[PDB]
């Protein structure tokens, strides 16, 4: 079994009118929120808190004064790139 519930449970709101259930913390950075909810698409997904940009991939939850039961605005912008490449291949791990 498992357990462990702490932190401040936040919701993300996206312009389609729709709500993603995302937990986050006053010391979390929101460059990792949008990498841990919105995984490559953290250059798109642009988060909006009290009409401002939470832009700052650092700017801490705690200093954006981002609480629980918190709603954060979600911003989609358009593809201005053509980047293209198969997977790759760097960076072992030996435990």
């Given at each position: 079994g498992s357990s462990g519930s702490s932190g401040?449970?936040?919701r993300l709101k996206f312009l389609n009118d729709?709500?993603?259930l995302a937990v986050a913390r006053p010391?979390?950075?929101v460059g990792t929120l949008k990498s841990k909810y919105f995984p490559g698409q953290e250059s798109q997904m642009k988060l909006?808190?009290?009409?401002?940009?939470?832009?700052?991939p650092a700017?801490?939850?705690s200093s954006l004064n981002i609480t629980n039961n918190?709603?954060?605005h979600c911003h989609r912008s358009p593809?201005?790139?053509?980047?293209?490449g198969?997977?790759?291949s760097s960076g072992p791990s030996s435990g």
């Amino acid at each position: 079994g498992s357990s462990g519930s702490s932190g401040i449970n936040v919701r993300l709101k996206f312009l389609n009118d729709t709500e993603e259930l995302a937990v986050a913390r006053p010391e979390d950075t929101v460059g990792t929120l949008k990498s841990k909810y919105f995984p490559g698409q953290e250059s798109q997904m642009k988060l909006i808190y009290q009409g401002r940009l939470l832009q700052d991939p650092a700017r801490t939850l705690s200093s954006l004064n981002i609480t629980n039961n918190c709603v954060i605005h979600c911003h989609r912008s358009p593809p201005g790139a053509a980047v293209s490449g198969p997977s790759a291949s760097s960076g072992p791990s030996s435990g």
